[PDB]
Ligand SMILES: CCCCCCCCCCC
Ligand SMILES: CCCCCCCCCCC
């Protein structure tokens with residue numbers, strides 16, 4: 001695709017957002033971005 | 044006694060051990076005095 | 084070909100798990116670290132298994148200064164990502180077409196260095212196990228394979244004995260002919276399954292032998308011997324022998340090791356809380372007169388109230404398990 | 406000398422203990438080590454106080470690999486010996502003529518090295534303290550003193566304020582004339598005795614100021630500032646450190662921050678009545694390195710009475726109080 | 727300015743400020759909140 | 765022989781003897797004695 | 803300069819986190835052991851009556 | 852030759868002692884914690900009957 | 901030169917084919933063991 | 941250089957005598973401060 005040809009040297013930084021989104025779409029609580037990224041017991 | 048000056052400092056720790064040993068009521072033996080194990 | 088079910092052979096393990104009980108359970112090579120370490124991890128789900136992690140380290144050459152991770156795993160998928168403080172990204176993707184057929188992809192991308200890749204296909208049949216993988220594949224102009232390809236096969240010849248072999252093929256530059264190498268494998272498990280023997284006869288002249296034994300319900304023991312042959316125009320054989328034991332309880336795991344080169348080591352994990360444990364490892368090399376110390380901690384949290392209560396043990400409304 | 410007894414002054418302590426509470430109780434410079442360590446003590450008496458010790462160590466430059474020690478101490482005598490691996494023998498001998506007049510000897514004899522000696526006389530009056538100390542004395546054939554000689558004086562001028570001074574005289578070579586230096590001291594203890602200030606004006610241009618405070622019955626705190634003067638053109642070298650100590654029934658914690666970027670901690674946990682486990686760790690944020698030490702201490706006894714007493718069950722009788 | 731940062735007076739001023747602020751923190755009631763009641 | 769001690773057969777025999785002695789010790793009841801009843 | 807402002811904040815967060823962990827974990831263990839001793843002695847005093 | 856044998860014996864006793872200390876102190880701590888857990892469970896069993 | 905590459909390639913191809921034959925014999929082997937054990 | 945050493949020795953002797961003088965003044969200090977506090 002054109003997007004894959006335009007961005008190839010920075011396309012590997014979107015892998016960990018994809019794993020975070022895949023985990024987030026299966027949770028019943030569905031926490032926010034800072035709750036996903038923080039190590040504290042956010043609940 | 045003045046010609047043994049070079050090795051006379053190895054008798055200080057036996058003197059402290061004897062000073063302690065003469066004041067104990069138990070009076071343990073030499074191997075027990077030098078043994079870390081409880082060893083009453 | 085009719086009495087295989089009459090023979091009633093079971094599937095052996097994988098070639099990767101040939102000496103798992105000695106190498107990765109009793110011995111402390113996979114657990115030893117140096118310096119100070121802190122690993123904080125959080126769990127958001129349990130049946131689709133979503134987790135994140137943070138790692139802090141100082142005083143070691145292997146571990147990064149900081150790393151962030153995330154993993155997701157349902158019954159036929161496993162994804163993982165990881166990024167360091169030098170901005171190196173690692174990925175992983177296992178997909179199981181069945182419970183006997185798994186395809187694995189493993190990438191590693193860092194700036195200023197070439198991209199590392201690794202592909203693998205695993206197949207576990209009723210009484211044998213095949214595994215073919217490929218480390219750093221590439222192709223030339225004419226269409227010649229470059230990099231190293233490994234294939235292995237393991238077969239149960241009797242309900243306790245297993246025999247196998249493993250082939251290798253490395254062609255580094257692509258303007259030279261490739262190499263080859265064949266290993267030979269053996270694994271014998273006792274009838275009571277209380278001791279396991281495993282031996283290898285590798286392509287690079289090595290020879291590894293291992294023995295595991297389960298002493299009590301809390302104590303295991305192991306011994307491993309490695310002999311490696313080489314050249315200086317003269318023969319040269321380098322040998323080693325390691326012996327160890329593992330004691331596991333409800334609140335602590337202990338591992339201790341002796342070596343024939345004059346090294347003694349220990350590893351202790353001490354669970355001072357249901358969500359907090361303290362690690363200690365120490366070594367003494369009696370041949371060189373030096374030591375290594377590591378101290379660390381592990382902290383587990385949760386991302387919702389049900390998981391918080393379950394990992395505390397209070398369960399629903401302060402009523403524990405039964 | 407008529408109204409001193411109406412003034413009602415007290416003894417101001419010693420010069421050596423001028424900042425004892427900050428420097429040797431709250432801070433962890435005397436306790437920090439690196440590597441692995443083990444101490445095995447053994448007691449034979451309590452009122453005449455006879456003890457032995459064994460020490461094992463690996464991974465540090467300060468500690469020796471092995472050392473054996475023994476000490477004896479009654480109400481007016483103190484003897485101590487110590488031998489390491491490689492055969493370095495060290496000795497110590499105090500003797501109190503009175504309860505306030507102590508003479509001290511201190512020898513250290515190692516092979517291939519000159520003998521080190523140190524003499525000291527300590528005197529504590531009703532409202533002042535004197536201390537004369539000679540480090541490595543020598544005399545030539547002509548009759549010239551060679552070595553270091555220190556004399557101190559500390560006077561209580563108020564029930565809370567103490568002032569004093571310290572004089573040094575060092576003549577190393579014996580051919581060139583020696584040099585002298587004068588320090589000035591100050592110690593102020595509060596009226597309720599919950600905070601203490603100490604200050605020094607050293608002969609090397611240094612300036613040390615300290616403050617101690619007892620926050621609760623288990624918590625103490627401290628802060629110390631050092632300014633050094635050097636000629637590298639004048640240069641000033643300085644550090645400021647702050648710390649706290651938490652004492653409980655079976656654990657002592659010490660933790661320290663520093664203005665050069667270092668943090669450190671020290672923990673001693675008594676896992677048994679006769680066993681302790683020590684941990685100390687340091688992170689230097691300016692240089693990005695670390696130090697770790699782990700060790701243990703074991704205390705035993707040499708007779709049944711002391712063995713039962715340190716276990717806590719005094720024979721058939723109850724522990725009671 | 728940047729000429730004052732290389733002067734020897736900067737170390738003296740910085741360590742004096744550190745000592746005064748630390749003494750004021752230690753004698754404050756903020757130090758009492760760091761002692762647990764147990 | 766000291767000439768035997770320079771051979772690779774010395775290391776082979778030493779590690780083989782260590783392995784068979786360790787296997788005999790592990791399968792002996794001394795290893796059962798090394799596990800406390802608790 | 804924006805990324806130069808971000809990198810120093812990341813390093814500052816790393817230093818604050820590791821300083822707080824090293825100074826705080828052993829003190830927390832000490833306070834936990836003291837709380838368990840107080841609870842055990844209170845249960846003994848309740849068993850006395 | 853007697854002093855060399857004494858040197859070898861002392862240098863062997865040091866290695867045996869430090870090996871025994873490093874291997875046996877954390878195992879002893881682990882066994883001690885297990886015994887205290889079993890004793891606490893026995894007190895809970897005595898309270899539960 | 902070039903003539904030593906053919907010997908190396910022939911030897912490596914021979915090694916790979918020998919490994920394949922050993923794997924086939926290993927797959928056959930349980931029935932052979934059963935036949936020998938039932939005969940004796 | 942013997943006349944250079946006499947200035948150094950004179951200076952160190954003067955330093956020691958000045959230290960003795962301020963020690964004597966420190967000993968007589970509490971009565972002086974008591975008189976000042978009582979008069980003031
Ligand atoms: C090397 C000194 C050991 C002790 C000697 C003193 C013995 C005193 C005997 C009193 C009759
Ligand atoms: C009585 C001899 C041992 C004590 C030392 C006294 C001298 C004091 C130090 C030198 C002035």
Ligand SMILES: CCCCCCCCCCC
Nearest residue numbers: 784787788789791792793
């Ligand atoms: C040659 C391998 C080891 C032989 C001995 C096995 C253990 C037998 C039981 C020992 C009591």
